[PDB]
Design a binder for these strands. Sequence first.
RNA 1: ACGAGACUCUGGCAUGCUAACUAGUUACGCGACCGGUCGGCGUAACUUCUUAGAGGGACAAGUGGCGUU
Lengths: 314, 138, 132, 189, 62, 65
Amino acid sequence: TEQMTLRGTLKGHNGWVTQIATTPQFPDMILSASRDKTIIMWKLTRDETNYGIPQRALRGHSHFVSDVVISSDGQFALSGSWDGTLRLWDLTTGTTTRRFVGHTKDVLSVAFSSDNRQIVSGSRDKTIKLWNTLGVCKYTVQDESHSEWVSCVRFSPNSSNPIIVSCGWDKLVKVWNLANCKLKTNHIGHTGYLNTVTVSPDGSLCASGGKDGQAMLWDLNEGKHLYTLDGGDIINALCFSPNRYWLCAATGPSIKIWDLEGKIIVDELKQEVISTSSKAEPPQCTSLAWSADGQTLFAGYTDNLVRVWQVTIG
Amino acid sequence: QSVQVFGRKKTATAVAHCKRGNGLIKVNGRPLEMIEPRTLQYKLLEPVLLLGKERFAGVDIRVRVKGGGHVAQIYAIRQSISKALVAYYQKYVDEASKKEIKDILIQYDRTLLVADPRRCESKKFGGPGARARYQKSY
Amino acid sequence: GRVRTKTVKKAARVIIEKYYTRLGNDFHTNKRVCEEIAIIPSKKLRNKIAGYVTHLMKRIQRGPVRGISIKLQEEERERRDNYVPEVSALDQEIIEVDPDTKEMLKLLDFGSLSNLQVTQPTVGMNFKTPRG
Amino acid sequence: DIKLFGKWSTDDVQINDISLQDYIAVKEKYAKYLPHSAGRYAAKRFRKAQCPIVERLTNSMMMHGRNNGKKLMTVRIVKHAFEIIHLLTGENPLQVLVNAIINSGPREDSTRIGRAGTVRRQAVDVSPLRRVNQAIWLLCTGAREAAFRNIKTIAECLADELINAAKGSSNSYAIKKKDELERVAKSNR
Amino acid sequence: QPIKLARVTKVLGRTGSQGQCTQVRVEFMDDTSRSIIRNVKGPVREGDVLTLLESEREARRL
Amino acid sequence: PVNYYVDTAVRHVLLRQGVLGIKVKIMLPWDPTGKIGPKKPLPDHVSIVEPKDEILPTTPISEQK
RNA sequence: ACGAGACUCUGGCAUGCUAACUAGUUACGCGACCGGUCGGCGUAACUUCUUAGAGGGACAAGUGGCGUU
């Protein structure tokens, strides 16, 4: 594939960069959730000494901000935390008018509909929630829920029938439609609990990655594992490039960038700090996303740093 | 309207109510330099020349302080002023200037915006102080 | 002093032994899973157990752990341990043997072997340690 | 650009001893306008030596009777006697104090004899940290005894004792007790 | 005796009746081939320099 | 845990030769949502739920409930 | 198994939450010079200082050195 490259070293965080969010609106507007008890913004500046210099600080929770997301624009962000609190932030003045509480335990991830009418969150409370943005009470189904934790729930960014892929610590994948609010399809076969389930904007593909050691993908049209894929370690986050059929995942310290032909490895782009000691554990890449241009990769890491990669070829 | 930042030392606590202005600083009916001790005055002046008068020229902060003792009322006015300035800059203008001033204040004094946790210890019977004991004959 | 008590150590041992699969390398996830899977009535006790759980996981990352044994990983231990060298260390085309064992083999009806090579015996019998 | 009080500069000072320079802090980031900052220096080791030398010196000023716990009085009597030494000498008071400490911090003196022994004493090296402690203690004690039963008041005995310790005059208690400590060290070989 | 400073290279331990002396290896920065045991008084860290006007004496060791 | 897991009764008993003292101390058992024990366990006691015995799947399958 | 520890109350941090004319921060009729002191008032930005309610937070958790490694 295209040869990757770094863009230097910069200071952007003192704790784990838990979540990232790049909107498809601007190339220099990124939101990051960290263990620094805050939510940070990143305006990319394309300077050698500094790339993203913070301008605004977002403090509104009591625990780790578990997941931050943007739908399509750059006006509002949706945030969850470890106290079960849901929030939305306007970037105009750094405040919030409304608070959503529905979880008595941990909240891991939250989903924002492209049309801003559905808020779906994963919780350790063992309860999938189906709520909205304006606080309008809607019919909800509590049956056929997970028997274990509920980690990550995402959204399909297209004008079609809504779909929720709910993953749990039960090693199960559950399929939900907003119209019927029932379990259309159940996928089993994981040897370990599933961490993150993601969907492509095409509205026909889905993937799951956790501690089972497999980043095997599922098709949401009917429901069946289609492509085989094994890993060297556990999987924590997945996505697709929103221009290619690429599957982007982090295998801990390194990443898994496959080719478009047949998803066969060409060269693992290993990253490691040059040191005389091999006794230092490599950082684990919790999450990653593509930029607006699609050639810049922004990823959070266990070493409280942002590794910004781009293409230079040769 | 305050930046909602507060500042403490010992049982004392001070908050800087904040508004848009031209850097006029006042402490409970008095500006920052007419405070009585005139030897702790340098302790009150620490921030305004630690980072310069220019940074204290576009924001009006009134520091209200309630607490015990003279010096314990100090280390609250100054810390409240510095942390109020840093919070005002962080929430209003940007972080780069805020980060610069935070680094400057921490380098000069790491306990410039963090509170001093120490408090007076309780007293246990059979002694006048926390650790002192009554004298007895052998 | 920061020495862990046998209560914290024993509970963390049982947690690793029984719920290895869910447990990870992060302390906070360990705390959450320990709260979910066991009734630990004290937050401080929860946190002590989670810290020992994290340290034990790092210990397994180093490799073997002396104080615990999990069969779910013992099977893969035996899987790794099945190491077979390509050429057996016992198949040496030339084996040096002493004249006395040469005589023993000749009396054992194995004097016609071809891999044996006689060795020069030591000229002295100075094998004991000087007494004193 | 930080100056002690309002006019003492921290660029004219030089240690030129190499022995005790990390336990003396006048030129580094430890520069402040007020010799009164409390701090957490006395709650852990490897952090007690980061206190500025002037801060430690003013900390050890108050002692005996009600005089203890009057750090503000120490700030006053330290701005005083420092104006006095600067007018008497014309030199920078910080460098004069550093000279007095270098001249007064004992190098070697007696303790117990190696592995075991209490009948007599055996000479050993004095740590730089303990030697600055001893120098400050002798300075303060000599000053307060010089004030003791004397017509002259405070802010004088400090000044003259410090200036003699810097110069080596035998009227200084600090450096005479220094020479005493090395004489005991020599006599206890 | 010639004046020659010594820098601390290892804190051996504590000695004395009340455990106030400190055995420490000290090296002279002239040849780095000599590293003698010295008993020292007072709070001693690792890596400072001890002024030595006298070096014909050694600390009890081994 | 002594205050609520222990019931203590100190009484004076009559005797011909004097007054006897009796101290009856009972450690109350633990039962949850019950009427014979405190609703919280001993803080030094940690209880672990036995995990499920689910067979690990060896091939992904589509289950229709 | 008891004791130790765990435990409880306390001392410290949450601009996260349930909120308070028996608490204040915000509401202004000398604007006393043509942007300012208030607990000299010139008589509805809501919980930030105050108040202990429920959760959270710290565990030797990360790095390095020593150590049956």
